[PDB]
Design an enzyme around this catalytic site. Sequence first.
Site, PDB file in Angstrom:
ATOM      1  N   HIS A 199      59.907  98.170 -30.584  1.00 39.44           N
ATOM      2  CA  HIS A 199      60.390  99.143 -31.559  1.00 39.44           C
ATOM      3  C   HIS A 199      60.765 100.428 -30.801  1.00 39.44           C
ATOM      4  CE1 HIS A 199      59.099  96.373 -34.641  1.00 39.44           C
ATOM      5  NE2 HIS A 199      57.875  96.371 -34.119  1.00 39.44           N
TER       6      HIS A 199
ATOM      7  N   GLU B   5      25.569  80.188 -50.699  1.00 42.51           N
ATOM      8  CA  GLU B   5      25.608  78.756 -50.956  1.00 42.51           C
ATOM      9  C   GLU B   5      25.100  77.947 -49.764  1.00 42.51           C
ATOM     10  OE1 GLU B   5      28.446  75.121 -52.483  1.00 42.51           O
ATOM     11  OE2 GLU B   5      29.407  77.046 -52.016  1.00 42.51           O
TER      12      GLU B   5
ATOM     13  N   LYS C 235      54.165  97.580 -43.063  1.00 42.63           N
ATOM     14  CA  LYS C 235      54.097  96.226 -43.630  1.00 42.63           C
ATOM     15  C   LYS C 235      53.079  96.115 -44.773  1.00 42.63           C
ATOM     16  CE  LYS C 235      53.659  93.105 -40.316  1.00 42.63           C
ATOM     17  NZ  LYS C 235      53.398  92.458 -38.997  1.00 42.63           N
TER      18      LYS C 235
ATOM     19  N   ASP D 165      29.726  84.483 -53.620  1.00 45.63           N
ATOM     20  CA  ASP D 165      30.288  83.235 -54.064  1.00 45.63           C
ATOM     21  C   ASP D 165      31.752  83.180 -53.682  1.00 45.63           C
ATOM     22  OD1 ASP D 165      30.352  80.751 -55.192  1.00 45.63           O
ATOM     23  OD2 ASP D 165      30.804  81.504 -57.229  1.00 45.63           O
TER      24      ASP D 165
ATOM     25  N   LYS E 262      55.495  94.658 -28.510  1.00 46.42           N
ATOM     26  CA  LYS E 262      54.664  93.519 -28.870  1.00 46.42           C
ATOM     27  C   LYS E 262      53.927  92.932 -27.661  1.00 46.42           C
ATOM     28  CE  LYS E 262      55.044  89.013 -31.087  1.00 46.42           C
ATOM     29  NZ  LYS E 262      54.264  89.401 -32.300  1.00 46.42           N
TER      30      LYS E 262
ATOM     31  N   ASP F 252      34.404  84.010 -61.868  1.00 47.61           N
ATOM     32  CA  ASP F 252      34.057  84.168 -60.457  1.00 47.61           C
ATOM     33  C   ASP F 252      32.775  84.948 -60.300  1.00 47.61           C
ATOM     34  OD1 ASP F 252      35.969  82.506 -59.451  1.00 47.61           O
ATOM     35  OD2 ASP F 252      37.322  84.094 -58.779  1.00 47.61           O
TER      36      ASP F 252
END
Length: 1208
Positions: A746, A912, A755, A819, A772, A1161
């Site tokens: 850039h 869980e 973004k 959960d 990058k 939920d």
Amino acid sequence: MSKLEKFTNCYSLSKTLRFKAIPVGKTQENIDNKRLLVEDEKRAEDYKGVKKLLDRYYLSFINDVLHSIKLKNLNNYISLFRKKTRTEKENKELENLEINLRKEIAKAFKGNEGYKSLFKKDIIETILPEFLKDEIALVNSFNGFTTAFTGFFDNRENMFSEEAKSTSIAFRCINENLTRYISNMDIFEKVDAIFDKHEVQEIKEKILNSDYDVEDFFEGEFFNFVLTQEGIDVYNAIIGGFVTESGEKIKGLNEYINLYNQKTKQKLPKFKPLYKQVEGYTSDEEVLEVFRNTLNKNSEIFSSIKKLEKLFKNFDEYSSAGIFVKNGPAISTISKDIFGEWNVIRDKWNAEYDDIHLKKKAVVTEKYEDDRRKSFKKIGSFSLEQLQEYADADLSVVEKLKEIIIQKVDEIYKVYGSSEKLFDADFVLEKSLKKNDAVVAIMKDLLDSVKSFENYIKAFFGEGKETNRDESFYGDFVLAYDILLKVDHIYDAIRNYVTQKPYSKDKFKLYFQNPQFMGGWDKDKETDYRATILRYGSKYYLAIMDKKYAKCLQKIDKDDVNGNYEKINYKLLPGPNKMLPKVFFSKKWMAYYNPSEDIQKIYKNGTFKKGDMFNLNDCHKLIDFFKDSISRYPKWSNAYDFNFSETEKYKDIAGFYREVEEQGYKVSFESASKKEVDKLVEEGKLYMFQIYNKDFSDKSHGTPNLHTMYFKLLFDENNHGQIRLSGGAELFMRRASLKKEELVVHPANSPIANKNPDNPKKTTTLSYDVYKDKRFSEDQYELHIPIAINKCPKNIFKINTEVRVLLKHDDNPYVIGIDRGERNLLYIVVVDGKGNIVEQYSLNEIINNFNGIRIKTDYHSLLDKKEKERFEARQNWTSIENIKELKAGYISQVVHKICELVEKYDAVIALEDLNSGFKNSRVKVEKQVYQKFEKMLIDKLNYMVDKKSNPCATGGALKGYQITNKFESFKSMSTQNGFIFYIPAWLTSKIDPSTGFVNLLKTKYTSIADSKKFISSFDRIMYVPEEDLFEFALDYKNFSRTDADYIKKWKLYSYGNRIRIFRNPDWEEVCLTSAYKELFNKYGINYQQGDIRALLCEQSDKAFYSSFMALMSLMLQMRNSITGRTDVDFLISPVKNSDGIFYDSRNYEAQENAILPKNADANGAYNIARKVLWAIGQFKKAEDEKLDKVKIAISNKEWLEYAQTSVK
RNA sequence: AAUUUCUACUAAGUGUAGAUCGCAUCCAGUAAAGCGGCAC
Ligand SMILES: [Mg+2]
Ligand SMILES: [Mg+2]
């Protein structure tokens, strides 16, 4: 104090911090000129080479032990194997005979022949040199650098275990190889006379050998001959045939059986060959060469597919009683494909198990269902006959299977047609494969169609010593399939290559021509290890002395004319319990001290130690001897500041040692002329690197990385040995893999789009360039430094027991429920000691704090955009990897959110148990990601730090909470690990939080008679005029499989409305009372008449009943969801609470942190937490010393009792 | 789109927020669940 407070300084933990090492000055020039690196780099090259030579000697070895072995266990074994079973655990006697066959092999390796010099330093030192010039040379290079092969060494010693793993040779020798030899004996016995006498022995006896006879290899006592690869090749050549060292091409046994198609009754079994035992990363040319070579239309994989097509085309020709399907997932799938539902096979099999075990008086109980389940799982496989036994007439199981399998081969052939240009000799690659999307998708398509065929087909092995089998079927099948198995390797390698990051992290260890390089820091061996650590202002440095100049750092002034580096002296006294007696019973010390015999006798006999020969005074005498010896030992008493407890208050010698270990280590800084060493760098007498991560940038103004804090804290006055510097540091070189000119950039002074859609600022304009993946475009040195946390723990106790005790005595204990949800990646419910919800919310959004500003990221929208991406890309590999990594990122964010909640509420965590489950398609975080999450949670809780706390504060970086034990295995994520409790999700979502009501009836329409029975099993069915409602009042006793309900009698009301799937060429919504009014009118039933159950049963056609039941089932369907709309996934309950009003979820949507769950939920995280409250309740019932024994595993019956009585 | 490394970023301008010993398992809730360090 907070329950949390008591959990500090509990056990030691070790971590390694990584940094970049930035060469300073002329260091790099010197390193290159003096060519220090290349030594370590070529070793990195030849590493792979030497590994092959190690495998060489390993294979000669394996074949020294194998030539020499006679299995004694075997002969009983053969007779038993051919005993044809007869079960009744008479075969159990044998299954213990099996293990001892592998036992005899493992022990034969270990037992004899210089096995011992195999994974130690002497294997490449001398052993590899004396075994088999261009190869001796490569091995020589590695000496004193035996480190390289340790990970390899572990991977290879699993070769010789009795482990019953596909790794083990023994498993291979006995488990696969032997059974085939036996199976072939029974084929040989049956098929003997098919051989022409001249045709039989004469060609084979002579051309394959001239030694032995063919008969021999089908005698049981001959098996040992076939353990080694030659005997394996000889055997397989007998079956397969031979080249003949000429045109001759002598025929094998299988060809002869084949040539007995002349009878064309045939289907006479062929022999199975014996398993011999003991990709494409580099290039596109490589990757493509393999694809072309293994998958073209005259490859062997494609050959095996044509044979399997021919085999299965004749599926009818074979005996359905002797064809088995392995038990496991393949049973669900094939059930789906054959009959039309998943659980059908399982269901029919449950219908048959009941009849045997289900006493008429008896009522099905959770254990009954658990045990029956254990039985099903235990069953190895199902014959086609048995499957046809479940087959309703008008369906043929073999024929429906034939059409499914054949279909899959046709799908391979069509996909070949679409890929045909790729197999042209003429074909060349226009673009790089990562660049070339179109090609990669052609390759994935074909690979997938074959892999799925393979993976489906593999099911037809009963994975058993099944008594009767269609050997005619399995001869052909096993011949062909084994090649097909080859796809799985190819598939994986090609996928790993496409899936790879564009850069590489490959690297190599640096010793700088020094086998002992950087072994230690604190220790004054600096002339030997030749590495040390320097400080200047806020910056830290690694300094590596040239061998010729080791002492160069010794003589340096504390120049104060201008500036100095600070110089590291680190003092560590290592393992006082071994060392103090080693030094102080030294002959020299013995001279220094005329030690009393009383002391010597105590040590030699060990009356100091525990073990009931211990004498306390003797112990104290030893201590005092050591203490005083310490005053008079210069090396130690000018190094460390010993401040010893009174000798009397020491319970044991061990108490004394911790203090020596604790005070044993000191770190502080010397002073050395900046100008002087700077010049040492210039002259190449010294090599210097800055130890660096971005937090050391002069422009870093944010909260630092946790590891950055660990590293600085190493040298802070306030850190009293809580985190310590350890040896075993390593330096690596990571050669660059990107070229800087080729990076995406850039450019400065142009806006870059932001973004995050929740970032209110839309663009950013910087005055410099952003690249990058910049860090992979430069050669990079990296420095791994080991540290010790809580090396000398003062608080010793059992973490699980202490959690229980504190929970027992806590007045308002708080629980965090987590959960995984359908509309929510993760959802959280914090609850008090009485089930009141204190906090509820989704973790779809992670909110970050920088300064006073909060910006959120909605990870659920991220996943949604990536799932659309995966759709647009036709589910290609790379999107799949992008989704996996996104999720793994997300969970590193969540770990922090949970830590804050634990700290905030002093709360225990409810999770869980993923060893008890049903896979749910709707939930977005799959099991494999969740398991990772749970491991990470545990790992954090071992030492839990809040970065923004002051480090010396409890919970800060020098006093982290240790509320978790070290992770052992996923299998080990059950019951409780400290503050973490593992709960089964059974009946936590579809249950009225308000009443604890759970729908235990079955509303599927079955028969007209059954519907009547159903209706009649109700106590009452009355329309209520006052409240304009229908009231169904029932007793769970009158219905089956309701044992778990505690409040047997519930009155159901029509009230509210429900969302129905209502599929049409799939969503519509329905009111409840309107349906009851409508339907009744429809059939001429007046409903203002009490108890209409007699009435209702008067109806004559399915239509009334079919629609009455569908109506009923909906009413009992508490959870309702459109799935177009985030807005409602609500919960409404057909049963009134004591106060008389039914629970809706939508009446709690509006509030913040409301008293009951807000959606379905939440209800799930809420109820996962209440099960822990239940567990806490059991603790409150036990005595302090019994707590350790108390059971946390709530049973559906305990759960419903708790859910239904605790509500009030 | 910058990283010890990862993920998400740009977070106010060469960085931000978490996390971060290493390897293997990453798709089967019916196979597997471990091998290292470290510590004993
Ligand atoms: Mg930071
Ligand atoms: Mg990134």
